[PDB]
Each structure stands twice: as structure tokens, then as C-alpha cells.
């Protein structure tokens, strides 16, 4: 009956909790002790990108660490040359309500999506001189919150309809759907080997999915509010989540439980974006209090802040070679920091 | 100027892109953005279909003023996540059906939505144009049955005018802060043409207020 199945689920959850607690020999901070801290590291803004005329919700670096795509509420997807602050491209979007944008690892495509519940793929390299929309992936019943290219023909998109999807761009059809995630999933992060991906939702939980199998592998909890940002450790065996709870957490895939928590009592604003540095030594989080915080990932303290924005920092990203970090904000300015 | 011939032509392209961005972002500041809200089957379609998938965007014009109204009632997801995208609209057109006072209660759901959205931190200053439509069916129902059959606190007379005034007063009693924003209440029906004029007048008031805020006088 329903009560019997509920009792079985409760017993399974208790067994899972006991198994997770059994293997927690020592805390992460215990091992990362008597180790040289990063120290107060100040990073200055080298470039300021001054084209957007509305709030910026998403930016993505190119794989060459030079091109940079950014989306704004003015219905603009601008591709910048970060070295010279030159605007390489400006794409007018059909729907100005865009909450995500992605850059193809090959560099030939960009993707965007938002409150239209569509994922638009635009081709950057055509025989004509204009950027053309290549595909319109539809099938999500909620707003699109994230999207990431697997290759030139595969893209995984998370929606507010509580499910993720993997698409075939050449046919515009969902090859697989990742369901079973109560509440809107607000972020996703592809593994460096592009074999798995994690997604954090409004149930205050993160889920690890196998792209090939199409089923959830592990579920991680510990937040008491909806998760807005998630990112993968460079190794690929861990990830970090930021939530409206005004805290960040580090989970380990193999240990299958929380490793440590990055928080401070002076911070009462949620995390909009999170990202790692090369070697995964610095966790770069964006907050609603108009500033970004650089935490030492191995420890739990603050390696620094950069601030520099007059409104909420919505998006941030780190280059593939770790040269700089770009931060966008609701004040309509992108800043490259080094 | 320490630039190659190809770099100089790249800067010229960027300058042309900037010029086109300014031109596109200057005609957007001359348009009026309205956020359309309301419960299901609450006459929202009637007021959005006066003249001329997630967000449904409707663009119309009235006396040299361009209005963009974004109906977002088909999202069916967590409103707290995508509601800050509309921080900056001129007004919130909130549609409520008067006849849905006894159909768990539809009117109670409408008041819950109004309380949730009016006192939102993102819409603390934006004005609300409250349309109370299907007033003909409300009159017919009141003639058939008084409001007191479902409502208990209604100690007034079972008259159509008194019941409508009671509903309106209860609805504008739901905003905690009456100094930051002004609620415009209008009684409409299926056959009406004053809705566009009323929203235009409310937008004119908020435009004057925005100009005063720009001066710093307000």
C-alpha cells in the first residue's frame, strides 16, 4: 500500500544516511590543516565591457579564452573580443527574456534560452557575414535556466519544469530526458570528460546524472533553500553548489556526501553564480550584495573579494587557461578581472 | 596608431556595432512595459484581446505610446525565480473575475496572488492597475444569490453596488505600503472600450512620477 511504500522509502533513506555517515572518517578541513593558505589575493579589473543596456544574466567564455558571449535583457547576445574589448558580434534575440547562454567548445555556435522555454542555437560561421539562428530546440514546459554544449550536435538543457533534457541538434529532438527532480532545476555543469553532469534544483538538492544511461546516479542534500548555481571541480570527482540559503557547499562524487561549507555570518544574500579556478584552488562565487567572493576551496575562509559592481552579480566565468575571470551584473557591465 | 590594418577595421566594426546598439536601445526606452497577471479563467484573455510556450508578448499602441504587455500566466513554475526579470515595468495589470467569488475558493486564490505580488520586494514601487471584470455575470449572480452565501464577514447589504465596493475595498486593503505605490482599480466587462484609456492614464501618471524621480523632486 501507500503507507508500506512510504515506510520502505524512509527505511531506504535512513540506510543511505547511515552508509554516508559510516565512511566519513574525518572532515575536509581537518586534512586541509597546517597547509599554507592562499592569502589575501587582490585582483584588479583589466577590461570593462560597455555595450549592454540592461541586466546581464549569463556569460560564457570561449574555449580559446578570448571570445566571450553574454546575454542581456535588451534582447542582445554580444560576443566580445576580451583582449581588445572589441564587439565581434551582436545577435538580436527573438525573446529578450534570456536567463542562460552557452558557447560551443568548437566555437562555431552559441546557445541561449529563457522564459520562452526554447533553446536557440545560432551559427557563428556562415558563408554570409551574419550570425544566423541554426536551431530552436523546443519541448520544455518551463523556463530554460541553463544549457551547455556537449559537442556541435549535442546540448543538455535544464528547465523550470523540474526536468533536464539532452538534445540532438541536427534533428531538434530530445534523445533522453532526466526527470525525477522536484522543483525547478536552476543550474547544470557538464563533467570535464562530458560523461556525467550535475544539476541543482529548487528542492535544495543536487543530482548527478549519467548522460549515456539517462538515469540519476547520486543525490546530494544539505542546503535549506533552492540552489541557484552549480559547477564541476576540474578533477571531475567533486562539485560546488551555491544557494539562496546564502552559503556554498562542496560535494564529492565518490564519498557521496558534503565535504565542507563556505559561508560567513556577515553574508545574508544568496549565491547567483559559482565557478572554480584552474587546479580548483579558488572558488569564485557571485552574491546578491553586489560583490563576488574568492574562497579558498581547500579551506573555508575568504581569499578575497573583487566587488566593482553597482548591482547584483548574476554570472561569472573563468577561462580555460585560468588567465582571467569575467563577471557580469545587473548594472549592465561585464568586467574582466586578473 | 600601434594598430595593424586589420585591427583598425576591427575597431571600426566594433564602433558600428556600438552605434547600432545605442540606436536599438534608444527606441526601447520609448516603449512602455506592462506585466499582465491574474489567476486562470479570470478574464485576462478578455482584457489582453481588446486589440491585436512561455511568455506571450503583445505590442499595441494608443495615442503615440507603444505598450509591450507580457502575459506570463502559462509558466506554472516557481514565481520567485523569474519575477525579478520584470523589475522595471511601468505597471502590473492584475486581472480578477468578480463572478469567481464562489467557484479552494477562486476569489481566495485571486486575493492570495494579489497579496503575493503587490507586496513583492521587486514591485515595491510599481503601480498596479487592478481590473475587476465579468461584472455583468457578477450582477446576474448577485441577483440570483447574495455574496453572503460564501463570504462570512460581509455584514453589508446584498446589493450589487455594495458588494462590488466591498470587494474593491478588500482588494486595496491587501497592500501593506500605500505610500510607495498607487493601486488603480477599474470595473470592466466583456463589452468595454475604456480599458485602454484607463491604462494609458495610469501609465501617464507613472511617467510623470518617473520624471519627477529623475529630477529628484520626488
Amino acid at each position, epitope marked *: 500500500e501507500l503507507d508500506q511504500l512510504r515506510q520502505e522509502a524512509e527505511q531506504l533513506k535512513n540506510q543511505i544516511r547511515d552508509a554516508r555517515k559510516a565512511c566519513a572518517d574525518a572532515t575536509l578541513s581537518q586534512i586541509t590543516n597546517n597547509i599554507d593558505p592562499v592569502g589575501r589575493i587582490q585582483m584588479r579589473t583589466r577590461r570593462t565591457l560597455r555595450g549592454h543596456l540592461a541586466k546581464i544574466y549569463a556569460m560564457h567564455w570561449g574555449t580559446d579564452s578570448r571570445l566571450l558571449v553574454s546575454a542581456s535583457q535588451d534582447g542582445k547576445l554580444i560576443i566580445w573580443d576580451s583582449y581588445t574589448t572589441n564587439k565581434v558580434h551582436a545577435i538580436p534575440l527573438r525573446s529578450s527574456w534570456v536567463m542562460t547562454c552557452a558557447y560551443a567548445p568548437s566555437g562555431n555556435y552559441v546557445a541561449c534560452g529563457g522564459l520562452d522555454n526554447i533553446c536557440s542555437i545560432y551559427n557563428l560561421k556562415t558563408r554570409e*557575414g551574419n550570425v544566423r539562428v541554426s536551431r530552436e530546440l523546443a519541448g520544455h514546459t518551463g523556463y530554460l535556466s541553463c544549457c551547455r554544449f556537449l559537442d556541435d550536435n549535442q546540448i543538455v538543457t535544464s528547465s523550470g519544469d523540474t526536468t533536464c533534457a539532452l538534445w540532438d541538434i541536427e534533428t531538434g529532438q530530445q534523445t533522453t530526458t532526466f526527470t525525477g527532480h522536484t522543483g525547478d532545476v536552476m543550474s547544470l555543469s557538464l563533467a570535464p570528460d562530458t560523461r556525467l553532469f550535475v544539476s541543482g534544483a529548487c528542492d535544495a538538492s543536487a543530482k548527478l546524472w549519467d548522460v549515456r544511461e539517462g538515469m540519476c546516479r547520486q543525490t546530494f542534500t544539505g542546503h535549506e533553500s533552492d540552489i541557484n548555481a552549480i559547477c564541476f571541480f576540474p578533477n571531475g570527482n567533486a562539485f560546488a553548489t551555491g544557494s539562496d540559503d546564502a552559503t556554498c557547499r562542496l560535494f564529492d562524487l565518490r564519498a557521496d556526501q558534503e565535504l565542507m561549507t563556505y559561508s560567513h555570518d556577515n553574508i545574508i544574500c544568496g549565491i547567483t553564480s559559482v565557478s572554480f579556478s584552474k587546479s580548483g584552488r579558488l572558488l569564485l562565487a557571485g552574491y546578491d550584495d553586489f560583490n563576488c567572493n574568492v574562497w579558498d576551496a581547500l579551506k573555508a575562509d575568504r581569499a578575497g573579494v573583487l566587488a566593482g559592481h553597482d548591482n547584483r552579480v548574476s554570472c561569472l566565468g573563468v577561462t580555460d587557461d585560468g588567465m582571467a575571470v569575467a563577471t557580469g551584473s545587473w548594472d549592465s557591465f561585464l568586467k574582466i578581472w586578473n | 596608431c*600601434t594598430l595593424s590594418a586589420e585591427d583598425k577595421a576591427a575597431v571600426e566594426r566594433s564602433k558600428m556595432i556600438d552605434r547600432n546598439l545605442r540606436e536599438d536601445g534608444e527606441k526601447a526606452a520609448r516603449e512602455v512595459k506592462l506585466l499582465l497577471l491574474g489567476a486562470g479563467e479570470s478574464g485576462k484573455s478578455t482584457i489582453v484581446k481588446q486589440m491585436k510556450t512561455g511568455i506571450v508578448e503583445t505590442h499595441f499602441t494608443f495615442k503615440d505610446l507603444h505598450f509591450k504587455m507580457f502575459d506570463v500566466g502559462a509558466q506554472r513554475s516557481e514565481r520567485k525565480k523569474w519575477i525579478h526579470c520584470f523589475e522595471g515595468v511601468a505597471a502590473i495589470i492584475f486581472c480578477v473575475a468578480l463572478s469567481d467569488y464562489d467557484l479552494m475558493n477562486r476569489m481566495h486564490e485571486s486575493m492570495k496572488l494579489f497579496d503575493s505580488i503587490c507586496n513583492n520586494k521587486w514591485f515595491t514601487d510599481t503601480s498596479i492597475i487592478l481590473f475587476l471584470n465579468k461584472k455583468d455575470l457578477f450582477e446576474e449572480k448577485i441577483k440570483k444569490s447574495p455574496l453572503t452565501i460564501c463570504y462570512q464577514e460581509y455584514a453589508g447589504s446584498n446589493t450589487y453596488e455594495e458588494a462590488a465596493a466591498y470587494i474593491q475595498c478588500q482588494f486595496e486593503d491587501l497592500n501593506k505600503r500605500k505610500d510607495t505605490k498607487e493601486i488603480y482599480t477599474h470595473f470592466t466587462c466583456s463589452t468595454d472600450t475604456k480599458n485602454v484609456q484607463f491604462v494609458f492614464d495610469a501609465v501617464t501618471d507613472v511617467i510623470i512620477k518617473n520624471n519627477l524621480k529623475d529630477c529628484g523632486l520626488f
Partner: single-chain antibody
Amino acid sequence: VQLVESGGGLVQPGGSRKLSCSASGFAFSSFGMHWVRQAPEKGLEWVAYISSGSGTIYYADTVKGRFTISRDDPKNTLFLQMTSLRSEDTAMYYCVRSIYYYGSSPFDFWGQGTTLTVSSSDIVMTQATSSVPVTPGESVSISCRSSKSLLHSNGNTYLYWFLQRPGQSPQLLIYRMSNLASGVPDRFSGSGSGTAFTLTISRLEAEDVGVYYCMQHLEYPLTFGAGTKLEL
């Protein structure tokens, strides 16, 4: 993508004629446009350039003053008006589209060209080879030299390679030092450093036979090199 050049014909000395190019199949207003010249027996020679949006305009020294270049973006047409046509202006004129942003390929498409017959500081590109015979299937390497270094402070070496088949307009092969173009076979490879550059074909077919030109884009005027002919 197509560029059809119209005009030309027989012109008396000291006369004037108007050359047009009707571009179609691409976003004309976003492309800078060049007029390039080729004498009946000599190589290619750059003539004029107009940027995107009719901004900067450049002319060759040998035609400065008596030539003018304009464009009509709404009509998608490029005009070259010439006055006081001397006897040295009898040649075939090609129209070349060229877009300039990071990672673009300038001079990617060349027009068919039109013939104009009239009755009777700069960087030097030199190619010391011509009429080189080679059997198909082998590997052939040709070389080009420059007056000064084409490498710039930003790291780009602005050297372009063009192949002109017999009876056809030249087509881009390598749009910078070691930067293969789009749609060309992978056997072509550009290389070089500083002032000496090389283009190599690993296994030449019977189709890649013609005249090979090296052009510089470091600064104006854009100077070509004398052709290096390949014979089967």
C-alpha cells in the same frame, strides 16, 4: 555568395568609365570591399578599398586622385568611377569582399572581374620562381619574400596566398601565415617566419594547377607578388 562585376569595354585614352559590382548571396553591408587589378600578362595589383558602412577609403598611389570608389548598401552594389583613363589602365578588374573581425578570413571571395581595354615605403613581395613543372602526386613547395617583417606586435603575420586557375578568378587558400581557408583541400599548407614564407602542396592533383600569388595585408597599399606558375 556571388559577385558579378559589370562595366569595362573599349575606352578611348583620356576618357572615363564606371565599374559596378552587383553582390548577392551574402550580407553586403557588413563586408569591406576591394577593387583589385590584373594586367593582361602581369600579376595582380590592388586598386581601391572601401570599409563597411562607407567609412575609411583607401586608394593606390598609381590611381589616387583619378579613381573613386563608392557603395550602395540598400542596392547591394559597389561602384568604381575612373577618370582620365591612361593607356596603363587596360586590365581585368576583380571585386573582393573582405570582413574584418577576430578570426575572420579577409579576401575570401573574389568576383569574376571585367575587362577594360584602352587604346594606345611600400612593402615589396618577390617570388623568384615561375613556370615550375611538376608531375601530379608529388609535393611542391613555393616561396615568397617580403621587404620587411609582416609579423605584427599582436602576433599575426599578415600574408595571404591566392590560387588563380587558367581562365578563372583567383581564390583564397591561406588567409594568414599558416591559416587554411574554408572549403580548400587540406593538402595545402602555409608556413614561414618573418620575411620568408612558403606554401606547400603534399599531393598536387590535376586541378590545383595555375598561378600562385602572395599578398601582404600589414599596411596599405596591399602589394602582391609576381606569380609563381605551376605546369603539369
